[PDB]
Ligand binder design. Sequence first.
Ligand SMILES: *[C@@H]1O[C@H](CO)[C@@H](O)[C@H](O)[C@H]1NC(C)=O
Ligand SMILES: *[C@@H]1O[C@H](CO)[C@@H](O)[C@H](O)[C@H]1NC(C)=O
Ligand SMILES: *[C@@H]1O[C@H](CO)[C@@H](O)[C@H](O)[C@H]1NC(C)=O
Ligand SMILES: *[C@@H]1O[C@H](CO)[C@@H](O)[C@H](O)[C@H]1NC(C)=O
Ligand SMILES: *[C@@H]1O[C@H](CO)[C@@H](O)[C@H](O)[C@H]1NC(C)=O
Ligand SMILES: *[C@@H]1O[C@H](CO)[C@@H](O)[C@H](O)[C@H]1NC(C)=O
Ligand SMILES: *[C@@H]1O[C@H](CO)[C@@H](O)[C@H](O)[C@H]1NC(C)=O
Ligand SMILES: *[C@@H]1O[C@H](CO)[C@@H](O)[C@H](O)[C@H]1NC(C)=O
Ligand SMILES: *[C@@H]1O[C@H](CO)[C@@H](O)[C@H](O)[C@H]1NC(C)=O
Ligand SMILES: *[C@@H]1O[C@H](CO)[C@@H](O)[C@H](O)[C@H]1NC(C)=O
Ligand SMILES: *[C@@H]1O[C@H](CO)[C@@H](O)[C@H](O)[C@H]1NC(C)=O
Ligand SMILES: *[C@@H]1O[C@H](CO)[C@@H](O)[C@H](O)[C@H]1NC(C)=O
Lengths: 135, 135, 135
Amino acid sequence: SIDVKYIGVKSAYVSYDVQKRTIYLNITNTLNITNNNYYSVEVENITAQVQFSKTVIGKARLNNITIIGPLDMKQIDYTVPTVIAEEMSYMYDFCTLISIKVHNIVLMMQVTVTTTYFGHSEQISQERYQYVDCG
Amino acid sequence: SIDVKYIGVKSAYVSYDVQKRTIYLNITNTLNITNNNYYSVEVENITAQVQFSKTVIGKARLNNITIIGPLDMKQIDYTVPTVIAEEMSYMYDFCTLISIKVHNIVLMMQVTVTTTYFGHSEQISQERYQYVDCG
Amino acid sequence: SIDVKYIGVKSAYVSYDVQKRTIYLNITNTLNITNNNYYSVEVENITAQVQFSKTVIGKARLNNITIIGPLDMKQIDYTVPTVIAEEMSYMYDFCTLISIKVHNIVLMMQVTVTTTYFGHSEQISQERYQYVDCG
Ligand SMILES: *[C@@H]1O[C@H](CO)[C@@H](O)[C@H](O)[C@H]1NC(C)=O
Ligand SMILES: *[C@@H]1O[C@H](CO)[C@@H](O)[C@H](O)[C@H]1NC(C)=O
Ligand SMILES: *[C@@H]1O[C@H](CO)[C@@H](O)[C@H](O)[C@H]1NC(C)=O
Ligand SMILES: *[C@@H]1O[C@H](CO)[C@@H](O)[C@H](O)[C@H]1NC(C)=O
Ligand SMILES: *[C@@H]1O[C@H](CO)[C@@H](O)[C@H](O)[C@H]1NC(C)=O
Ligand SMILES: *[C@@H]1O[C@H](CO)[C@@H](O)[C@H](O)[C@H]1NC(C)=O
Ligand SMILES: *[C@@H]1O[C@H](CO)[C@@H](O)[C@H](O)[C@H]1NC(C)=O
Ligand SMILES: *[C@@H]1O[C@H](CO)[C@@H](O)[C@H](O)[C@H]1NC(C)=O
Ligand SMILES: *[C@@H]1O[C@H](CO)[C@@H](O)[C@H](O)[C@H]1NC(C)=O
Ligand SMILES: *[C@@H]1O[C@H](CO)[C@@H](O)[C@H](O)[C@H]1NC(C)=O
Ligand SMILES: *[C@@H]1O[C@H](CO)[C@@H](O)[C@H](O)[C@H]1NC(C)=O
Ligand SMILES: *[C@@H]1O[C@H](CO)[C@@H](O)[C@H](O)[C@H]1NC(C)=O
């Protein structure tokens, strides 16, 4: 949330990179670094805080009632066939893949019916994704 | 949340990288580093905090009632066949894969019906993902 | 949450890397490092804190009632066949795999019906994932 990077290959503060087939002959490198860093993140100052929830019921009739959670899956159908016939023939199935429901990165976080939240929360993702490398 | 990186190959503060087929002849490297780092993360100051929940019921009729959790799976069908016939033929199935429901990284975190939360919580993911490398 | 890295190959503070087929002849490396690090993470200051939950019932009728947990699996069907016939033929199944429901990394954390939470909690994942390397 402050100093988040995505760095492909090389990361450095001071880099004297030298690579194939070079001459580094009579150099006189000199450095003088002062890199102070003061972090005061998420410092808080609270005198009072109240999280109050009340429920009063009385002399009431509560008939057929449903409270359903956030995500519901019902009557979901995946009906993928694969019929292959061959009579005096040549078939060369190379790098053939059939992909059905699939995830890689799944993060859920208090997806509820009732929630009273105070504070800090976050979700950070960094990857190098690559599905198929079919050479 | 502060200093999160994704670094591909090389990470350094001061790097004098030298690589194939080079001459590093008469150099006079010199360094002088002051790298102070002060972290005061998540320091808090609370005098009072109350998490209050009450429930009062009375002289009430509560008939057929359902409270369902966040995620419900019902009547879910995966019906993938694979019929392969061959009569005097050649078939060369190379690198063939059939993928049905599958996860890699799954993190859940207090996905509830009722939640009273105070404080800090987060979810961080860093990977190098690669599904198929079919050379 | 502070200094989390994902570093591919090399990690260093001061690195004088030298690699194949090089001459490191008359160098005069010199260092002077002061790398103070002060961490005061998660220091707290509380005078009072109350987690209060009460439930009062009285002279009420509670008929057919269900409270269901967060995740419910019902009537889930996986019906994948694999019929292979062959009459005077050649079949070369190489690197063939059938994948049904499967996980690698699964972390759950107090996904409940009722929860009163105070403090800190998090979930961190770092990997090098690779499903199939079929050379
Ligand atoms: C630097 O090095 C080269 C070597 O080829 C030399 O000829 C030259 O006199 C040097 N200079 C100093 C200032 O040392
Ligand atoms: C290097 O940095 C320090 C930091 O104050 C300074 O006092 C000094 O003059 C600088 N130069 C040299 C040659 O040390
Ligand atoms: C708020 O400021 C500082 C904390 O950073 C502290 O000196 C002061 O007393 C705090 N206020 C109260 C009411 O505690
Ligand atoms: C509502 O009540 C009737 C009978 O009073 C019942 O048949 C029906 O199933 C109830 N509603 C639901 C959604 O179940
Ligand atoms: C640096 O090294 C080279 C070696 O080829 C030499 O000729 C040169 O005189 C040197 N210079 C100093 C200042 O040492
Ligand atoms: C190096 O850094 C220190 C830090 O204060 C400084 O006193 C000094 O002058 C710098 N230079 C040398 C050559 O030490
Ligand atoms: C808030 O500020 C500092 C803690 O960082 C402390 O000196 C002060 O007493 C705190 N306030 C109370 C009411 O404790
Ligand atoms: C509601 O009540 C009736 C009878 O009073 C019952 O048949 C029905 O199943 C109830 N509702 C549900 C959703 O079960
Ligand atoms: C550095 O080493 C080389 C060896 O080839 C030499 O010729 C040169 O005089 C040296 N320089 C110093 C300053 O030692
Ligand atoms: C190295 O660092 C120290 C730290 O204060 C400093 O006193 C000194 O002058 C620096 N240089 C040398 C050559 O020691
Ligand atoms: C809050 O600040 C510091 C702790 O960091 C301490 O001196 C002070 O007494 C704390 N407050 C109370 C009420 O204890
Ligand atoms: C509700 O009550 C009736 C009889 O009073 C019963 O048949 C029914 O099964 C109840 N509801 C549920 C969901 O079981």
